[PDB]
């Protein structure tokens, strides 16, 4: 069984659990503080692994005790780390995460880039024959476009049977990332990006942006409590309602869980409509649990 | 010149500077993240040192890289650490501090006690003859009352000329701490404690609580932008208006700066009225600066 490769950046989430969202200028005693491995594509590997799909993670890494914590954790999920790009400068990024016990909301304070990104030349070294799906978390787009061109060139020399399926996520509302819309068989665009571009609903965003994706591609937009929508070459808008848990306790990585679950379902040969449904359900289940493990 | 001893707990402040206060459930890129030594009595040593008063700090400590950072920092200010109480269990407490660049507000997320407190038996080892003033940050009150009884017993065997002046801070609205009101020549009570007990202004709190302090004591209550008030045995309410800086950039430790500056002024023989004024002015100056060093 060929692997699913995720290219992205691992982040250390330093999570403070509070009984209510802190009022500016107050002092509040937290219920707990914990470390959790995070990062979008990183979290998606966790979920893919939990769902039973062998996968590999490619990201930059700075040796030290933080690296040990996050790499050990990836190893626990049997994520293949052959393509870890070790950097002799910079550090693993940290995100300070406030979770409101009352609501499950997650509020993320993150920082400037703390280490070099995975480059096109790094990706050149990947043995593409090992993978049936490659997902790219949009970040350093000019480099990633080259990576995507490399996969495309590879696929031209392949039977349709042996083509590597590609997905990309455009989550941050940064201009440089929009070029990624034209790559990938599946394109995840965030609600935040949609709203930044002036769309007020997933349906609106999908209709508004479909003209930018590559021929044959499926564009997917999750819209929180409003569920998720997709639009493919046939012009039929597809939708799944959200599947909230009875009590929301932790929504950190819920979007990553959605992405992973859609990739999983699609990679398993399911329809887009079913993949959306499955994504919403697994993401919802996740929101009712601390971290990811209880989704299975 | 005998030292001023501060008994309290050193804290590592992990400070995230943000351009606006984060909205719940958002993700925000911080401007910077820095480590700063904190803790109330710890910060007051910094200020006392900067103002030119030799001082000593007594608190619990767990060896490790965090201890090294905070102890090196205390050494930079020439704070005497002879009475550091090393603990073979627990860790230096962390406080997660969000500072709003726009307002200078500080929002503090702190955690359960991470190491043993300084005990009465620890304090027994202090050479009281070395100190002309001892300030206690209220925390483990039952133990600290014994410490205060030890100082009292010491002072009975002294000339008035050689009596150690004592101050206590009651900052958290915790019942156990109220017993400390009856100790100390100078009693700092926080606005938060006052409000918890049903008073709506410093004047109200002082009148409301003076009957609980020891004969001769001065009760002090700072009330933020409303300045600070004090009440002594003569029943005359004293007041200083706040002295805001032209632009408030960082209010973390402003209250500690006030406390230290009042202790300093009083220890220098100044009147309570002048000490209040001086406290408000130095605290105000501090609020216009990052950290403490520019106050002098």
UniProtKB/Swiss-Prot annotation, chains A, B:
GO terms for molecular function: ATP binding; fructose binding; identical protein binding; ketohexokinase activity; protein homodimerization activity. Its EC number is 2.7.1.3. Requires potassium. Inhibition by ADP. Gene3D superfamilies: 3.40.1190.20. ATP binds at residues 224-227, 253-256. It comes from the Eukaryota. Keywords: ATP-binding, Carbohydrate metabolism, Disease variant, Kinase, Nucleotide-binding, Transferase. Homodimer. It is linked to Fructosuria: Benign defect of intermediary metabolism. Belongs to the carbohydrate kinase PfkB family. This is Ketohexokinase. It comes from Homo sapiens (Human). The gene is KHK.
């Amino acid at each position: 069984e060929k692997q699913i490769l995720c290219v992205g950046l691992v982040v250390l989430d330093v999570i403070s659990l509070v009984d209510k969202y802190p009022k500016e200028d107050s002092e509040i005693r937290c219920l707990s503080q914990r470390w959790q491995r995070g990062g979008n594509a990183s979290n998606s590997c966790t979920v893919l692994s939990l769902l039973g799909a062998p996968c590999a993670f490619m990201g930059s890494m700075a040796p030290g005790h933080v690296a040990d914590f996050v790499l050990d954790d990836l190893r626990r999920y049997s994520v293949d780390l052959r393509y870890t790009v070790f950097q002799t400068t910079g550090s693993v990024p940290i995100a300070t995460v406030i979770i409101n016990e009352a609501s499950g909301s997650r509020t993320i304070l993150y920082y400037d880039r703390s280490l070099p990104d995975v480059s096109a030349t790094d990706f050149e070294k990947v043995d593409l024959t090992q993978f049936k799906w490659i997902h790219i978390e949009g970040r350093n787009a000019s480099e990633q476009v080259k990576m995507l061109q490399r996969i495309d060139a590879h696929n031209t020399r392949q039977p349709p049977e042996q083509k590597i399926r590609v997905s990309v996520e455009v989550e941050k509302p940064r201009e440089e990332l929009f070029q990624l819309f034209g790559y990938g068989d599946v394109v995840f665009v965030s609600k935040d990006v949609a709203k930044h571009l002036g769309f007020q609903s997933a349906e609106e965003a999908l209709r508004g942006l479909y003209g930018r994706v590559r021929k044959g591609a499926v564009l997917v937009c999750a819209w929180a409590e409003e569920g998720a929508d997709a639009l493919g070459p046939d012009g039929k808008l597809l939708h799944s309602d959200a599947f909230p848990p009875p009590r929301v306790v932790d929504t950190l990585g819920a979007g990553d869980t959605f992405n992973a679950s859609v990739i999983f379902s699609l990679s398993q040969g399911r329809s887009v409509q079913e993949a959306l449904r499955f994504g919403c359900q697994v993401a919802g289940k996740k929101c009712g649990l601390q971290g990811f493990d209880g989704i299975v």
